[PDB]
Amino acid sequence: EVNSFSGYLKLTDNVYIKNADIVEEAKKVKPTVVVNAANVYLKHGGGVAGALNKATNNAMQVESDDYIATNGPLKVGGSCVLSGHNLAKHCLHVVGPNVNKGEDIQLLKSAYENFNQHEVLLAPLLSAGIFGADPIHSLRVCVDTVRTNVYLAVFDKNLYDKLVSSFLE
Numbered sequence: 270e271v272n273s274f275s276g277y278l279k280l281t282d283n284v285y286i287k288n289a290d291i292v293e294e295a296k297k298v299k300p301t302v303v304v305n306a307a308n309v310y311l312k313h314g315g316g317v318a319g320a321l322n323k324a325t326n327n328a329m330q331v332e333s334d335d336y337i338a339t340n341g342p343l344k345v346g347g348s349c350v351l352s353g354h355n356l357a358k359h360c361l362h363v364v365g366p367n368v369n370k371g372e373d374i375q376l377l378k379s380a381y382e383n384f385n386q387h388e389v390l391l392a393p394l395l396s397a398g399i400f401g402a403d404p405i406h407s408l409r410v411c412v413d414t415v416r417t418n419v420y421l422a423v424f425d426k427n428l429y430d431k432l433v434s435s436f437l438e
């Protein structure tokens with residue numbers, strides 16, 4: 270079956286959320302598009318990016334290095350489409366701002382706007398975790414910006430409960 274998302278809570282007509290590891294979701298669903306929370310040189314050294322690259326047995330990193338050699342780095346707020354490998358048909362590598370490194374939180378709207386070029390996506394909460402953005406603000410930007418169908422996987426039950434409560438106020 271195609272894009273077999275299960276156990277998500279529908280927040281708006283196009284935004285769904287689950288307490289789950291995005292890697293486990295991608296292996297089970299094999300979505301058309303999985304979003305990676307990338308950096309501008311596509312160096313998947315840890316966090317979400319590291320876990321998705323390890324699940325491809327480093328094929329995503331080798332492919333990424335070859336993309337960067339030919340095209341140069343991405344811009345913060347930008348994206349590129351590469352192979353999904355065993356995780357999806359395509360991986361959309363999106364660069365959200367890293368606020369802990371001084372990047373502008375306003376670019377989080379540009380980052381989510383890349384999702385609108387794909388009908389259905391499995392994605393993480395952009396710029397959250399060690400990128401330093403307020404996760405409740407990131408969910409609000411997603412809901413206000415994405416118009417195609419996005420399934421958010423957040424791998425932390427405590428944060429998932431805070432996000433759902435904040436949305437439902």
Ligand SMILES: CC(C)[C@H](Nc1ncnc2[nH]c(-c3ccc4c(c3)C(C)(C)C(=O)N4)cc12)c1ccc2c(c1)S(=O)(=O)CCC2
Nearest residue numbers: 290291306316317320394396397398399400422423424425
């Ligand atoms: C907010 C947070 C809960 C969320 N985390 C995540 N959200 C969704 N799916 C996730 N999988 C993992 C993961 C990370 C290591 C590993 C694994 C899985 C497995 C068990 C496969 C293993 O063995 N190692 C994390 C993760 C999050 C959201 C966005 C960003 C970050 C983190 S970041 O990576 O800090 C910086 C980029 C932006």
